[PDB]
Design a protein around this ligand. Structure first.
Ligand SMILES: O[C@@H]1[C@@H](O)[C@H](O[C@@H]2CO[C@H](O)[C@H](O)[C@H]2O)OC[C@H]1O
Length: 400
C-alpha cells in the first residue's frame, strides 16, 4: 500500500464531505492506494509552502494558483513532470486548464477550478438604500451607490484588509478597466513605463477616490478574509468584492450558517471606467489546481485523474462550490449565480489571473502592500505604481 499526500486550503464542510466521498470511492476501487488530505489555511499555506516544498515533509500534491510562483518552482526543480502519466487527465480536463499547469512541455500539475472575482451584494440592504443593483454599470454609478449606502447608515463594503489581497482586487480591476489587456501585457514585457504607466497610476487614483468615501467597515485593516466574509454573511455590510467561492463561505462564516440567502443576494461584474480601454466582460480570477512536488509518486496521478473526473467535478459544481474544469461537468452548474458566472468566464476575451499570483510572491506582495497603502494614505498612486514597476524589473532580471 502507498499513500498519496495532498495539501489543500479547503475549509467548507460540505466540500470536504464530497472530497471524502470521492476519496472513499477511489480507495475502494484502488485497494493499494490511500489518500491523505492535509489542510493548511490560505495565508498559512502560502507562508509555509516554500519551507515544506524544499524539505522532506513535501507532499505529493499541493494546491496551486499557477502563475509566477509555479513557474519559479518548476525552474528550480521543485516539481515533478508527470507528462508520462497524464493521458487520462488530458482526455477529461479542459485544454486551457491543463496548459495552465504545463511548462516547457512538462506537466507539473492539473487544474481543479476556474473562478471570477466580482461584487457580491445584498439586495435587501440595497433596497433599503434605494439602489437598483442591476443598474450599476460604471464606476461613477458604483461610487454613487456607496454614498447612498452611507446615507442609509449601512456599511457599504466588507474587506479583509489584514490579508491585503482582498484589497488588491480593487487596484487590479481598476488597472484592468483603465488600461485594458494591452496595458497589462506591455507591463509584463517591461515595455514603456511598465507598471508605472498611466493605467496603473489611474488605478491608484480611483482606489484613493473610493477610499476617500470611507466605504469600509471600521477597523478593516485588522480583519482577515474570514472576518470580512462573516460581516457580509451577517448583513453588516452591503458589498463584498470576492471570488465566486465566497457564495458558500459567507454562509459558513455567518452566525446563522446561512448568510445572505438567495432571495437577498446579488452578483455584479466589476463596472467599466469612463475613458478606460478595458471591457466590462474582462474578468479577474484564476485557474487553480494541484501541482506535483518533486518526487511525486505515480499513484498521485492515479488519484488526481479520479478526483478531477467528470463525476467528481459535477458533484462539486452541484454543491455550488466550483466552476469545474472537467469536460461535461458544467451540467452540474444548476445554481443561478454560478451558472451566470461560468458564462461570464467562458465569454471573456481577457481572463486575467490575480495580479498577486501572476507576478509571484515578491512583486505580488508589493501589489498587495500598495493596495492597502493607497487606501491608508501611506503611498501616493504614483509612488505605488513606481514600486510595482521597480520590483517587477528586478524579478525579470533575476529569473530565466
Ligand atoms: O493570493 C490570493 C489567494 O490567497 C486567494 O485564494 C483564495 C482564498 O479564498 C479561498 O480560500 C479560495 O479557495 C482561495 O483560492 O485567491 C486570490 C489571490 O489573490
Amino acid at each position: 500500500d502507498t499513500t498519496v499526500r495532498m495539501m489543500h486550503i479547503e475549509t467548507d464542510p460540505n466540500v470536504l464531505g464530497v472530497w471524502e466521498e470521492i476519496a472513499k470511492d477511489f480507495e475502494a476501487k484502488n485497494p493499494d492506494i490511500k489518500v491523505n488530505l492535509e489542510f493548511l489555511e490560505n495565508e498559512a499555506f502560502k507562508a509555509k509552502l516554500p519551507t515544506l516544498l524544499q524539505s522532506q515533509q513535501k507532499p505529493d500534491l499541493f494546491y496551486s494558483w499557477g502563475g509566477g510562483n509555479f513557474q519559479v518552482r518548476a525552474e528550480s526543480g521543485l516539481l515533478e513532470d508527470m507528462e508520462g502519466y497524464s493521458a487520462t487527465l488530458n482526455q477529461e480536463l479542459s485544454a486551457a486548464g491543463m496548459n495552465a499547469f504545463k511548462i516547457d512541455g512538462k506537466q507539473y500539475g492539473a487544474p481543479y477550478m476556474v473562478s471570477q472575482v466580482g461584487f457580491w451584494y445584498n439586495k435587501k440592504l440595497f433596497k433599503q438604500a434605494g439602489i437598483d443593483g442591476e443598474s450599476i454599470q460604471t464606476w461613477d454609478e458604483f461610487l454613487t451607490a456607496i454614498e447612498k449606502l452611507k446615507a442609509a447608515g449601512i456599511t457599504p463594503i466588507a474587506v479583509g484588509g489584514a490579508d491585503k489581497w482582498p484589497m488588491h482586487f480593487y487596484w487590479s480591476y481598476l488597472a484592468m478597466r483603465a488600461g485594458g489587456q494591452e496595458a497589462f501585457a506591455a507591463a509584463m514585457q517591461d515595455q514603456g513605463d511598465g507598471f508605472a504607466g498611466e493605467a496603473f497610476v489611474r488605478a491608484g487614483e480611483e482606489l484613493k477616490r473610493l477610499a476617500a468615501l470611507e466605504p469600509f467597515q471600521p477597523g478593516f485593516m485588522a480583519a482577515g478574509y474570514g472576518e470580512s466574509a462573516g460581516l457580509f454573511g451577517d448583513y453588516k455590510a452591503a458589498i463584498h468584492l470576492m471570488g465566486d467561492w465566497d457564495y458558500n463561505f459567507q454562509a459558513q462564516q455567518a452566525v446563522d450558517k446561512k448568510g445572505v440567502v438567495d432571495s437577498d443576494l446579488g452578483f455584479m461584474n466589476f463596472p467599466v471606467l469612463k475613458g478606460g480601454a478595458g471591457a466590462g466582460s474582462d474578468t479577474l480570477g484564476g485557474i487553480n489546481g494541484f501541482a506535483f512536488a518533486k518526487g511525486a509518486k505515480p499513484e498521485a496521478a492515479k488519484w488526481l485523474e479520479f478526483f478531477l473526473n467528470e463525476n467528481s467535478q459535477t458533484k462539486l459544481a452541484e454543491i455550488d462550490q466550483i466552476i469545474p474544469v472537467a469536460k461535461g461537468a458544467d451540467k452540474g452548474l444548476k445554481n443561478p449565480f454560478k451558472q451566470k458566472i461560468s458564462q461570464t468566464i467562458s465569454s471573456a476575451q481577457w481572463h486575467q489571473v490575480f495580479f498577486d499570483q501572476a507576478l509571484g510572491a515578491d512583486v505580488g506582495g508589493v501589489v498587495n502592500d500598495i493596495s492597502v497603502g493607497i487606501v491608508n494614505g501611506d503611498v501616493t498612486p504614483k509612488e505605488a505604481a513606481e514600486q510595482v514597476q521597480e520590483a517587477w524589473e528586478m524579478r525579470l532580471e533575476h529569473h530565466h
